Amino acid sequence: RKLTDISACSINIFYSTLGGSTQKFAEHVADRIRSSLQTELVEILNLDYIDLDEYFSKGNSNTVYLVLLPSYAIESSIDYFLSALQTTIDDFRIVARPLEKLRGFAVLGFGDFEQYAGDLFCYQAIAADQRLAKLGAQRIAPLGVVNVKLEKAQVYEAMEAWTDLFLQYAK
Ligand SMILES: Cc1cc2nc3c(=O)[nH]c(=O)nc-3n(C[C@H](O)[C@H](O)[C@H](O)COP(=O)(O)O)c2cc1C
Ligand SMILES: [Mg+2]
Ligand SMILES: [Mg+2]
Ligand SMILES: [Mg+2]
Ligand SMILES: [Mg+2]
Ligand SMILES: [Mg+2]
């Protein structure tokens, strides 16, 4: 089986969304991974409605975490996700590197390169990528970033390319 080929027991796809698009993209990435690995062991999880302590201050051995995250320059629920990661990083009550037992992680960022070019472009996905590594999760693939101001056809090939690249790194 292909899941065992990537030394994983299952794949968790976390996302956050305000306008709904990242949720659709997460569903599409999930369906692509189900087909490629011919597995049903792929979960999609909305970061706003799960207990973050259950997934990011402790981790099921050999799980892959994919994190799909838009960035918002305004206050949003994504701020809470990032704050929760940092709190776990600094909290003496939690041992260091609690996610070292995972297979690993990879982050795919979505953002608006036309209005937020520069420091703000996919800045929260950048932060999430930095913080997951500090929690001890092995970075399986380098951070991906998608400019959603491209034509929608280009947005989908960008995320499908990233998904296929992740699966090759995961081998
Ligand atoms: C109010 C607002 C602020 C945004 N700020 C950023 C930003 O700081 N950096 C970035 O890359 N994209 C930014 N964007 C673009 C969004 O991240 C992008 O539209 C994303 O696809 C939204 O995802 P969603 O539909 O799942 O909520 C912003 C969009 C809005 C509406
Ligand atoms: Mg959300
Ligand atoms: Mg998006
Ligand atoms: Mg925000
Ligand atoms: Mg982003
Ligand atoms: Mg990454």
TrEMBL record:
Mg(2+) 2 binds at residues 69, 71. Coiled coil: none annotated. Residues 11-167 form the Flavodoxin-like domain. The chain holds residues 78 to 248 of 683 of the full protein. Mg(2+) 3 binds at residues 74, 76, 79. Belongs to the TYW1 family. Mg(2+) 1 binds at residue 48. FMN binds at residues 17-19, 21-22, 71-73, 112, 120, 122. Mn(2+) binds at residues 51, 53-54. This is S-adenosyl-L-methionine-dependent tRNA 4-demethylwyosine synthase.
